[PDB]
Amino acid sequence: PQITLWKRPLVTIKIGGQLKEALLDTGADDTVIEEMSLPGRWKPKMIGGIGGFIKVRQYDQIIIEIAGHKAIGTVLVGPTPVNIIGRNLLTQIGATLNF
Amino acid sequence: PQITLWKRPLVTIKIGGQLKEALLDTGADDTVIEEMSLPGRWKPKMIGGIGGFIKVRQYDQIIIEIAGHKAIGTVLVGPTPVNIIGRNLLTQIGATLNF
Ligand SMILES: CCC[C@@]1(CCc2ccccc2)CC(O)=C([C@H](CC)c2cccc(NS(=O)(=O)c3ccc(C(F)(F)F)cn3)c2)C(=O)O1
Ligand SMILES: [Cl-]
Ligand SMILES: [Cl-]
Ligand SMILES: [Cl-]
Ligand code: NA
């Protein structure tokens, strides 16, 4: 689609068998999801943004469906105030900024 | 332009006659830039990001060039890891997210 930015660019995702709402965020290096269980191994990570840093769990090789488009990559899980799809997965669905 | 997301979407902005680098961030409602002098009065605001909330100074009706496009709108000044152009000015420059 072509998404205008008059409102927050929220889309439905599917991750870990669960349907969720998430924010498409061109400013985020990484994808970070509110607390949930994911299979496989993880390791701890600290990531920074406005407000400072949070500790998250880093799960690699996780498949997510974003607005109908399948991608795989690293997903971080931790106390983010909103689910965020960042550049590591936006590239895989061919997202661009256009003006 | 069409900007892909394999790297951070950094562009040149001009504010107050000074060139700066800023991040185009579709996950940001607002534009927040690092400490600098702006003209006029300011109002208080608190904004949230992934690490919690920060206090900023809100300046309205500020002239700012973004990647060669003119905008005139609200700029928040406060502690921020990078200068962020959010949706309030991305809409002024006609930006959309496409996939
Ligand atoms: C101005 C607030 C912006 C935002 C708002 C989130 C939000 C939305 C709705 C409701 C509540 C909150 C969105 C955003 O991109 C970030 C930052 C980047 C500026 C962010 C988001 C996601 C992950 C990170 N960490 S990171 O390691 O992937 C990373 C670190 C640094 C930068 C850098 F470019 F900003 F420097 C980009 N990415 C940061 C953030 O902290 O909050
Ligand atoms: Cl769960
Ligand atoms: Cl990845
Ligand atoms: Cl504005
Ligand atoms: Na894994």
Automatic annotation (TrEMBL), chains A, B:
Q: Which GO terms describe its cellular component?
A: host multivesicular body; virion membrane
Q: What is this protein called?
A: Protease
How is the protein disposed in the membrane?
Lipid-anchor
Q: Where is the Peptidase A2 domain positioned along the sequence?
A: 20-89
Q: Name one Pfam family in it.
A: RVP
Q: InterPro entries from the xrefs?
A: Aspartic_peptidase_AS, Peptidase_A2_cat, Peptidase_aspartic_dom_sf, Retropepsin-like_cat_dom, Retropepsins
Keyword DNA-binding in annotation: no
The molecular function terms in GO held by this entry are: aspartic-type endopeptidase activity
Keyword terms: Aspartyl protease, Host endosome, Hydrolase, Protease
GO BP annotations, alphabetical order:
proteolysis
Is Hydrolase given among the entry's keywords? yes
Query: Where is this protein found?
Result: Host endosome, Host multivesicular body; Virion membrane
What is the originating organism of this protein? Human immunodeficiency virus type 1
